[PDB]
Amino acid sequence: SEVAHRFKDLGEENFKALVLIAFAQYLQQCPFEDHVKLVNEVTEFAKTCVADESAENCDKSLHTLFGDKLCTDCCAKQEPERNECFLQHKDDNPNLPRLVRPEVDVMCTAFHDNEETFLKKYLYEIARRHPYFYAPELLFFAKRYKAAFTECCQAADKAACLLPKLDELRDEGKASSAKQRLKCASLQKFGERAFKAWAVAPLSQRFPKAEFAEVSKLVTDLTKVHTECCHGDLLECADDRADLAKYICENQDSISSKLKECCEKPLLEKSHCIAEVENDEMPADLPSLAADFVESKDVCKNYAEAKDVFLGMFLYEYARRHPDYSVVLLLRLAKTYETTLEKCCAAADPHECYAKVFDEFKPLVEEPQNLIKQNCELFEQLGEYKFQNALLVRYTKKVPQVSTPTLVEVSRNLGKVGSKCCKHPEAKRMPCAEDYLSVVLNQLCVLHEKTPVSDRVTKCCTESLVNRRPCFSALEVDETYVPKEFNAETFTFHADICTLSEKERQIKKQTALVELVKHKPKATKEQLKAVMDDFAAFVEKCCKADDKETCFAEEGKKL
Ligand SMILES: N[C@@H](Cc1cc(I)c(Oc2cc(I)c(O)c(I)c2)c(I)c1)C(=O)O
Ligand SMILES: N[C@@H](Cc1cc(I)c(Oc2cc(I)c(O)c(I)c2)c(I)c1)C(=O)O
Ligand SMILES: N[C@@H](Cc1cc(I)c(Oc2cc(I)c(O)c(I)c2)c(I)c1)C(=O)O
Ligand SMILES: N[C@@H](Cc1cc(I)c(Oc2cc(I)c(O)c(I)c2)c(I)c1)C(=O)O
């Protein structure tokens, strides 16, 4: 029996959580309760197989069971076409209502009256809005959510204790989903082979002391864990993830020195810990990569006799000695190396041919460095808000076809690069910046993949996972774009508009700035400033009220 094997490893509590998460990811539209009913049934059934390893249907597969319950065009098929149906049906942007939070005491009451249904609510919601969220990590968030309500619903002030923490979680939560969506995307649109090269780079950076073999052993388990979590096998993923966390801690001494504090904590806490670890200290006297990848006369022989490994070795050896490079940059060099050999090992005298392959990297390394240097200066010079507006404008001209809600969303997140990385010294900027920009651009890609409207976005998105940032950065203003004509419906007054927080106002204002640019593509920074300002003064005056709607309607219709 499989269902029992898992229940035994994960425990009862977690098993219920993963099964719940597992259903909410497959059926994002069904109600909370319905799911609960499917979980409890599955939970009991397991308990029998735990007792009777030979009971009825215990020999089944997690996909058939989970599959059957969910069935009580996708179901009218069978394993595994049936499964690949649910996976292919996951919605990255469901039409689900805005998840707002009621009055502090309101929640606090419901948290006490029933603590279990409260959390399952949490997991349900978060899981349905993020059908790719890293299951194991979600358990980590759940426990931190629980801790918040148990310590804040019992103090002098609550909305001063809780809210501040609920903020930091939704934020860290959004980063987690993002980060993971890139992983699932990599595996899917490019295959695991692609995912392995990737994994070899970050790991060789965090664990410079580890031997190449050790790194491969982890990249293999790691590739298996994420394949499962991304494919929908959440139970096995958590089991595998925990086994690996154990492995890492046991061999801790042949991997990284930073794994100490991490390895002395509860399962959930050490997994998250290992996942966020900082780079270990790089070894001192390391031979020059040149010696073995350029000067040796057995390069081509090694490429031929074992390309996949030789390359692995190369990436690992370059990555470990360059913590200051972004993962994507390292893959670009890795690709350049493969192409230069592929060509050179056929030519007359190979050695001469690829003797200058390091020369071909220089260009690829400064392109990233300069951009990060420029937008960081700009960041200090303009502040987060004005900086995003600068991006808003820049990217709206590159891809005007894209929907406004999306351009605002992405651009803001692109803008967050400045404050999230610029405070770091040069050595830590690029890997913080460019790897982050890759996540954000992937959100653009997955959203855009639903209802495509720009072949430029589709090109930059599907042509190469590693070149995405450079590709987008290279785009020139789309001249084939056709000025969007004035609608006005976009500016229909709404009471709330006058009683908005600073964040809300900034969003409303950036939304307007995108519509402006879409309408007048040939506008200049100066005149955009003018139309913005005038209209800004307009909204501020009309809010001073009297009969607002009239003001905004009367004066508005005029504008
Ligand atoms: N910027 C990249 C770099 C990075 C990638 C991987 I792959 C990795 O290895 C793990 C190990 C475990 I255990 C996890 O639960 C996870 I998630 C990743 C680590 I450490 C760092 C990222 O963080 O995505
Ligand atoms: N006044 C500057 C021009 C400049 C404008 C922007 I807006 C900018 O910020 C980005 C961020 C990303 I991410 C991109 O892909 C791109 I293209 C530009 C940068 I850096 C430089 C100069 O002349 O130096
Ligand atoms: N129609 C929306 C409400 C809405 C009204 C306006 I008027 C508006 O336009 C601006 C322009 C600037 I410049 C501002 O600084 C601000 I605040 C609002 C926007 I965007 C949205 C709805 O029905 O939800
Ligand atoms: N008078 C023209 C129509 C027109 C109305 C407005 I109001 C306007 O100003 C803005 C300001 C912002 I901010 C926007 O996002 C947008 I879209 C338009 C402009 I320029 C033109 C006609 O009837 O031909």
Cβ of residue 414 lying under 6 Å from some atom of ligand 2:
yes
Separation of CA 199 and ligand 1 centre (Å): 8
Q: Residue 78 and residue 64: Cα distance in Å, rounded?
A: 9
Q: Where are the domains of the chain?
A: 1-91, 92-181, 189-280, 281-366, 367-478, 479-556
Radius of gyration for the alpha carbons in the chain, expressed in angstroms and rounded:
27
For ligand 1, residues with CB inside 6 Å are 179, 199, 202-203, 206, 222, 241, 244-245, 271, 274-275, 277, 435
Of the candidates 169, 150, 144, the one whose C-alpha atom is nearest the C-alpha of residue 107 is: 150
The number of beta carbons lying within 10 Å of the beta carbon of residue 424 is 14
**282: nearest Cα among 341, 324, 345:** 324
Supply the CATH classification number for the domain 92-181: 1.10.246.10
Residue whose CB lies within 8 A of the most ligand 3 atoms, among 385, 489, 497, for a mutation test? 497
Q: How far is the centre of ligand 4, averaged over its atoms, from the C-alpha of 512 (Å)? A: 10
Identify the three-state secondary structure at position 344: helix
60, 2 Cβ separation under 8 angstroms: yes
Ligand 2 center from residue 389 Cα (angstroms): 12
Six-digit token string for 351: 């050695």
Non-local (6+) Cβ contacts of 124 within 8 A are: 20, 24, 32, 35
State the Cα–Cα distance between residues 365 and 470, nearest whole angstrom: 12
Give the integer Cα–Cα distance in Å for 242 and 265.
13
Ligand nearest, relative to CA of residue 373: 2
Token pair for residue 332?
């670009």
Token pair, residue 402, equals: 């894209």
367-478: same fold as 189-280?
yes
CA angle centred on 133, ends 130 and 136, rounded to 5°: 145
Alpha-helical segments (H) within 451-501: 455-462, 468-474
The protein residue whose alpha carbon is closest to atom 20 in ligand 4 is: 531
Token pair for 433: 């910046």
Ligand 1 atom nearest to 277, measured from its CA: 20
Pocket test for ligand 3, best of 499, 539, 552, 557 (most atoms within 8 A of CB): 539
What single letter denotes the amino acid at residue 554?
E
224 known ligand binder:
yes
CATH number of 281-366: 1.10.246.10
Pocket of ligand 3 contains residue 529 by CB under 6 Å: no
Technique used by the depositors: X-ray
| CATH architecture for the domain at 367-478 | Orthogonal Bundle (1.10)
- The encoded tokens of residue 173 equal 């939560």
* Burial category of 164 from C-beta neighbours within 10 Å (exposed 0-12, middle 13-18, buried 19 and up): exposed
CATH topology for 189-280 is Serum Albumin; Chain A, Domain 1 (1.10.246)
Q: Mind spelling out the 3-state secondary structure of 94-124?
A: CCCCCCCCCCHHHHHHHHHHCCHHHHHHHHH
| Angle (deg, nearest 10), helices 116-129 and 135-152 | 140
- Which residues sit with their C-beta closer than 6 Å to ligand 4? 486, 512, 515-516, 519, 531-532, 535, 559
* Beta carbons within 10 angstroms of residue 314's beta carbon: 21
Q: Are 173 and 126 in contact (CB under 8 A)?
A: yes
Residue 5 CA, chain-centre distance (Å), reads 31
Ligand in closest contact with the CA of 488: 4
Q: Which of 186, 254, 263, 259 is nearest to 222 (CA)?
A: 186
Between CA 346 and CA 349 the distance in angstroms is 8
Asked whether the CA dihedral 418, 194, 205, 134 is positive or negative, the reply is positive
How many whole angstroms separate alpha carbon 322 and alpha carbon 320?
6
The answer to whether the CB of 334 falls within 8 A of the CB of 197 is yes
Query: Whose Cα sits closest to atom 15 in ligand 1?
Result: 275
> 467, 330, 409, 345: which is closest to 92 by C-alpha?
409
The CATH number of 479-556 is: 1.10.246.10
Q: Give the ligand at the shortest distance from the Cα of 370.
A: 2
Q: Decide: 204 and 316 in contact? Cβ < 8 Å.
A: yes
Name the closest-CA residue to atom 9, ligand 3.
Answer: 491
Nearest CA to ligand 1 atom 14: 275
Tokens of 463: 């042509």
Q: Whose CA is nearest to atom 16 of ligand 1?
A: 275
CATH code of the domain made up of 1-91: 1.10.246.10
Q: How far apart are CA 102 and CA 71, in angstroms?
A: 34
What gap in Å lies between CA 59 and CA 55, rounded to an integer? Answer: 8
Cα of 142 from ligand 1 centre, angstroms: 20
Q: How far apart are CA 365 and CA 360, in angstroms?
A: 9
